[PDB]
Amino acid sequence: QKVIMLKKLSTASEEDENHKAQLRDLEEKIEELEKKKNKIQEDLTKLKE
Amino acid sequence: MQNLSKMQSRLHPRPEGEGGGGGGRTKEKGKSLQETHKEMLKNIESTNIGKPTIVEAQRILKIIDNLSTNLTIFIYLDSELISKFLDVAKHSKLSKD
Amino acid sequence: DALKVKKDRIQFMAVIEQLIQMVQNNSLTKFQSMTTLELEDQDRLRKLIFREKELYQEIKKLQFDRNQENKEYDNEQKDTNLKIQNLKERLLYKKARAQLKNQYKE
């Protein structure tokens, strides 16, 4: 709980809104980058085969 | 009729009784809650490393840590251990030194 | 900022009072599980823009690897087809010399 509240309190309502929306977009960017990976590796694997 | 055919026979012998194999099913060691929380507590703490927190935030964290330390001091001061100070001299299980 | 700091403080007030009742009932397991869930909710803050740059850079390298590898795929395909053709033609000429020389032996 100490750690949870440390992150929460450092995560003011603006930072919690970041969790929800801004870090939402950051995580979505990471996921889409992973999808771009998947595409490029799948091309590479078709090509290797 | 000089064929040397070596066709398969009809051997009856049964698949005799199967032995009582050593089914030593290893007991997987369940991770403790402290072990479970290690990684994710450190994850929560990493973002906070260098995080500037409001004054009320620091007060909340200090209250949390005070509660934790008091709970640990209670753990070491359980009623069982405290009651042994009822008779310090007579509590031979309590070291005189 | 202050609003959510106070909200978190009240959340921990509820956490502590729930743990109070759970201690009274010896039910510390419920407090443990609730702390687990609260930790999980407050798990992941920053780590996001940096991961995004890492992913983009690896994506770029991966794309370039795809491009080059397609180049070498085409190159190897063409070259090895040419080698098969040349081996067939060499077999053709060796058959030609063999058969002609043997015909003249005949």
Q: What is the DSSP letter of B50?
A: T
- The label of the residue with tokens 């008091």 reads B70
Phi, psi of B87 (to 5 degrees): -135, 90
Is the CB of residue B82 less than 8 Å from the CB of residue B74? no
Q: Determine the 3-state secondary structure of B17 from DSSP.
A: coil
Angle at C37 between CA C31 and CA C41, to 5 degrees: 140
> Residues for chain A: how many in total?
49
- What gap in Å lies between CA B28 and CA A41, rounded to an integer? 37
Is the CB of residue A41 less than 8 Å from the CB of residue C59? no
Q: Which helix (H) or strand (E) holds C36?
A: helix C28-41
State whether A9 and B60 contact (CB < 8 Å).
yes
Experimental technique of record: cryo-EM
For A7, the closest of C12, C45, C63 (CB atoms) is: C45
- What gap in Å lies between CA A20 and CA B66, rounded to an integer? 30
For residue C5, count other CB atoms closer than 10 A to its CB: 24
Resolution in A: 3.6
State whether B44 and A3 contact (CB < 8 Å).
yes
Tokens of C26: 């010896």
Is the CB of residue C44 less than 8 Å from the CB of residue B43? yes
State whether C69 and A44 contact (CB < 8 Å).
yes
Question: What are chain B's partners, defined as 3 or more CB pairs within 8 angstroms?
Answer: A, C
- What gap in Å lies between CA A36 and CA C60, rounded to an integer? 9
- The label of the residue with tokens 């077999």 reads C91
- What gap in Å lies between CA A42 and CA C53, rounded to an integer? 21
> Residues for chain C: how many in total?
106
The size of the B-C interface in CB pairs under 8 A is 41
Q: What is the DSSP letter of C26?
A: T
Of the candidates B74, C1, B60, the residue with the CA atom closest to the CA atom of residue A1:
B60
For residue B43, count other CB atoms closer than 10 A to its CB: 18
For residue C13, count other CB atoms closer than 10 A to its CB: 12
